[PDB]
Amino acid sequence: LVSQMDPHGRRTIFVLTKVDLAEKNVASPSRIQQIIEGKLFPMKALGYFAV
Amino acid sequence: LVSQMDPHGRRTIFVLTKVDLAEKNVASPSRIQQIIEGKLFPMKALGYFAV
Numbered sequence: 218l219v220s221q222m223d224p225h226g227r228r229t230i231f232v233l234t235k236v237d238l239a240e241k242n243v244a245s246p247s248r249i250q251q252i253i254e255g256k257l258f259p260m261k262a263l264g265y266f267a268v
Numbered sequence: 269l270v271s272q273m274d275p276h277g278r279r280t281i282f283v284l285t286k287v288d289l290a291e292k293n294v295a296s297p298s299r300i301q302q303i304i305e306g307k308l309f310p311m312k313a314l315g316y317f318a319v
C-alpha cells in the first residue's frame with residue numbers, strides 16, 4: 218500500500234504494534250534488527266521506527 | 269489460493285497457530301470462534317483444527 222505511495226519513505230514513518238507478542242511467541246531479535254533497519258519494509262519509511 | 273484451487277472444501281484444512289493468544293485476547297476471540305465454526309471462509313473447507 219505505502220511502497221506504491223512513496224517508495225523512498227519521504228511521506229511516511231514505519232511504526233510497529235504488539236512487539237510483546239514476539240516475546241509471547243519464540244522471540245527472534247535478529248528479525249527486529251532488520252525491522253529497525255527497514256530491510257524487509259519496501260517503503261523505506263523515514264524516521265525512527267517507534268513501537 | 270485454496271479458495272480457488274479447493275473451493276469445494278475437499279482438501280483444505282485450516283489450523284490456527286498461537287492458540288494461547290485467544291486466551292490473552294491478543295487475537296480477536298470472536299473471529300477465532302467464527303473461524304472455528306467456519307463462518308469467515310469465502311469457500312468450503314475440509315475441516316479446522318487447533319495447533
Ligand SMILES: [K+]
Nearest residue numbers: 293294295296
Ligand atoms: K485485532
